[PDB]
Amino acid sequence: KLAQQSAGKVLTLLDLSEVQLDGAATLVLTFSIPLDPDQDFSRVIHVVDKKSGKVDGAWELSDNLKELRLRHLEPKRDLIVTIGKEVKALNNATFSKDYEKTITTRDIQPSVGFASRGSLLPGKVVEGLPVMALNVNNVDVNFFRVKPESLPAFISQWEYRSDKLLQMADLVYTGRFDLNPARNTREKLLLPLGDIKPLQQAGVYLAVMNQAGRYDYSNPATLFTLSDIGVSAHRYHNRLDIFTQSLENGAAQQGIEVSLLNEKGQTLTQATSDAQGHVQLENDKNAALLLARKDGQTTLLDLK
């Protein structure tokens, strides 16, 4: 097959490197021509940790057959790679001699955090929060329900970037979540909240990861909203056609207090949704947020 194009070409080891493949540090050996897939690579290529010995895992040839990979490397480790003479190519080429190569794997630090700062998008329930983790098996998380009256002030502070700046909210839940990402694999995971009843009550919540551990921490706080009010804003020249509709059945929602707030969370204008769940306002160059509320339910919409 590919053996015909590489016929007459020598087998050369072009490179030895560490690359991030999927979410894990991977050892890559790049060869000049396609390698034979039927050979036992563990018999001809040895990877040995200077202190702990024989590195576990099997070699994986790339689809192009010129790269040989060994995934999920341990960080900050000294490795001896011995490429034996008898490594065979598709065209039957071999090396002239053994090669010995060293590599110190990258010092990648344990890291955990939320996938994002969150969204103002409302939900009827909160099933899970997406998180990401590398060699952080568990995390302690504090959940705060923002006081209904403190919300425009709270959200305006949050949207602009804080120890006592949290008495705008009430602690409603503390839990330890066992992530256990696969060793040396940066994984996308979920904090399951579905069965935590206090996080299923209407409101805007802030989830905060405990700040105790020598980790990167990326996004330690995230925001989520539990609301029945679905808000949509349509812009045409200077007009805002705002529709408030139920997240349960899509029906028009009447009597919803809709406000346009500035960057300080101050009301610029206010109106009530009609029988068709409609609110028509002029655009305000200072409007940063749209706020919709009724009977303890609150939805925010970013106009920026």
- Enter the CATH topology name of the largest domain: Immunoglobulin-like
The CATH level-2 architecture of the largest domain is identified as Sandwich
Number of strands: 23
Number of domains: 3
Shape: elongated
Main sheet: strands, sense, barrel:
5 strands, mixed
Subcellular location: Cell inner membrane
Family: Belongs to the protease inhibitor I39 (alpha-2-macroglobulin) family. Bacterial alpha-2-macroglobulin subfamily.
Organism: Escherichia coli (strain K12)
Protein name: Alpha-2-macroglobulin
Short description:
The PDB classes it as membrane protein. The entry lists the keywords Bacterial pan-proteinase inhibitor, membrane protein. By secondary structure, the protein is mainly beta.
Q: Which keywords apply here?
A:
3 domains; elongated; Immunoglobulin-like; five-stranded mixed sheet; mainly beta; 2 helices; 23 strands; 304 residues; four-stranded antiparallel sheet; 4% helix
Write a structural description.
It is classed as membrane protein. Keywords: Bacterial pan-proteinase inhibitor, membrane protein. It forms a monomeric assembly. The protein folds into 3 domains: 13-104, Immunoglobulin-like, CATH 2.60.40; 111-226, Sandwich (Immunoglobulin-like), CATH 2.60.40; 229-302, Immunoglobulin-like (Sandwich), CATH 2.60.40.1930. The strands form 6 sheets. The chain has a 5-stranded mixed sheet, with no helix packed on it. It has a 4-stranded antiparallel sheet with strand order 1-2-6-5, with no helix packed on it. A 4-stranded antiparallel sheet has the order 4-3-7-8. Strand 19 (257-261) and strand 20 form a beta hairpin. The protein is built from 2 helices and 23 strands. The protein is elongated and about 85 Å long. By secondary structure, the protein is mainly beta. Helix content is 4%, strand content 46%.
